Every structure is written in structure tokens, then in C-alpha cells.
């Protein structure tokens, strides 16, 4: 409702995807870090991509 053609969909998808990736990695790493399991964010970022 704010932006026009290939800007409402383009920018809206970027915001949703960036927000989803940040929360998905945090949620996954919250589980392993509470159990003392250390995994590099590289591996989780590959799955979440």
C-alpha cells in the first residue's frame, strides 16, 4: 500500500526474509547453546538459506 511496482514486492520480501533469517538462526542457536553445544553460525546459515 506504500510502494509501487517491483518496490512494494521487492522491498517487502527483503524485509520479511531478513527478519526471518535473523530469528530462525537465533531460535536454533538458543536451543544448542542452552545445552552447551557449540556450532558455528556458518552451518546453521547454510540450512536457513
Amino acid at each position: 500500500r506504500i510502494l509501487g511496482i517491483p518496490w512494494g514486492f521487492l522491498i517487502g520480501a527483503e524485509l520479511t526474509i531478513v527478519q526471518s533469517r535473523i530469528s530462525l538462526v537465533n531460535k536454533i542457536q538458543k536451543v544448542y547453546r542452552s545445552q552447551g553445544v557449540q556450532i558455528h553460525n556458518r552451518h546453521i546459515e547454510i540450512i536457513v538459506r
Binding site: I2, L3, G4, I5, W7, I11
Partner: peptide, 23 residues
């Protein structure tokens, strides 16, 4: 009535306008 419709402006393809509204 159609006179009042005539003031509504479409901005399709105007990147500079959408950049201003993005800011």
C-alpha cells in the same frame, strides 16, 4: 465527479518518487 477523479495521479515507473516515499 469525474473532475475529482482527474486529480488522482499514478506514479508507475517513477523511481525518484518511490525513493522519496521509501525515505
Amino acid at each position: 465527479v469525474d473532475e475529482l477523479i482527474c486529480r488522482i495521479k499514478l506514479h508507475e515507473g517513477d523511481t525518484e518518487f518511490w525513493k522519496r516515499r521509501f525515505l
